[PDB]
């Protein structure tokens, strides 16, 4: 089947329908809130590693808060929820890329663009690794350029439809 977990409402009001990663969920120990536009892609895309990690973290928090946590772990719970939470085939694709010598995602690190003035960002994409090290930025700068193009085209189309409606 397909994943189904709905993300819980973001604590931060800056992103009304987005999602926030607290200081504990990040290595840089800071808070990063992503807006509704980026988080909405997570409901329909099937190949976004970041949206699978978001679903994992959200499931973890909700389980810790609504169920009585004990030190002994209920392996059963994650065993039953896994396919409702993540696409295991995404994992298989990263494994296949790894064994063929193609750069692959190890779910650790993600990059995104930030439109400084406005604060909108893009949906983070996995920073690929190869030969035991992270790819240099110049090796995938084309994808970054593409993401910028997408953020432009989609914003322009929204403004067009707005102008039309008014």
């Amino acid at each position: 089947g397909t994943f189904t977990w709905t993300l819980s409402d973001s604590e931060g009001k800056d992103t009304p329908g987005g999602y926030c990663l607290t200081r504990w969920m990040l290595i840089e120990a800071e808070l990063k809130c992503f807006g509704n536009t980026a988080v909405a892609k997570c409901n329909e895309k099937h190949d976004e590693e970041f949206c699978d990690m978001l679903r994992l973290f959200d499931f973890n928090k909700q389980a810790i808060q609504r169920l009585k946590a004990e030190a002994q772990m209920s392996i059963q719970l994650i065993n039953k929820a896994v396919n409702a939470l993540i696409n295991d085939q995404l994992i298989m694709k990263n494994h296949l890329r790894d064994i063929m010598g193609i750069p692959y995602c190890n779910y650790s690190k993600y990059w995104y663009l930030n439109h400084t003035t406005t604060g909108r960002t893009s949906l983070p994409k996995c920073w690929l690794v190869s030969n035991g090290s992270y790819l240099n930025e110049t090796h995938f700068s084309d994808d970054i350029e593409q993401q910028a193009d997408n953020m432009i085209t989609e914003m322009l189309q929204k403004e067009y439809m707005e102008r039309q409606g008014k």
Binding site: M25, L26, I64, M73, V82, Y107, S108, L113, E145, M151
Partner: protein
């Protein structure tokens, strides 16, 4: 510091998977041969590739272990998933065990086309479970190690080479029983 389209600044984040520790096991790699899977903050399994065996018999008394019911259920679940994920396992002598007192000790004898061997399947499963970074045809793996040993352990900061992550265990969950052989007509 890197600016795209003159208005888009490139920024990064890295997730701390360690915080998932209470709801799913976390695997990591110390070096090429040593890997760990932690369950909670108190226990886990250490998987070591080694030339030094610790079991010198042919027994694996799983049913007696089940009846005595002294072991940790999560660890036994992990062991079962690992073994059921091995492709084409057909040499029962290659696997020996010790469960006395509720402990978990499992030893795979890897000594000997090298592809259609227990060593290849065991090593592929081992590489998949931690996924922490000789060469064979297709997806074939070979090492110089004579044994793979899986023993229970207490929590310790083992993740020097790779960060803890749940991805390997979750991925292997779907591999279970996928490549097992029939051993009798009535399963």
């Amino acid at each position: 510091t890197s600016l795209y389209k003159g208005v888009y600044e490139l920024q990064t984040l890295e997730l701390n998977m360690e915080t998932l520790n209470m709801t799913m096991p976390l695997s990591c790699t110390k070096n090429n041969s040593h890997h760990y899977i932690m369950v909670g903050n108190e226990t886990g399994l250490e998987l070591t590739l080694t030339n030094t065996s610790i079991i010198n018999h042919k027994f694996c008394n799983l049913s007696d272990a089940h009846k005595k019911n002294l072991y940790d259920h999560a660890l036994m679940s992990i062991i079962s998933t690992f073994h059921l994920s091995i492709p084409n396992f057909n040499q029962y002598e290659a696997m020996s065990c010790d469960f006395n007192g509720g402990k978990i000790s499992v030893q795979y004898n890897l000594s000997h086309n090298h592809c259609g061997t227990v060593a290849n399947g065991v090593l592929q499963t081992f590489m998949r479970m931690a996924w922490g970074g000789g060469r064979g045809n297709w997806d074939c793996i070979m090492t110089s190690y004579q044994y793979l040993i899986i023993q229970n352990t207490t929590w310790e900061d083992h993740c020097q080479f790779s960060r803890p992550s749940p991805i390997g265990y979750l991925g292997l969950l779907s591999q279970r029983t996928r490549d097992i052989y029939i051993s009798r007509r009535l399963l």
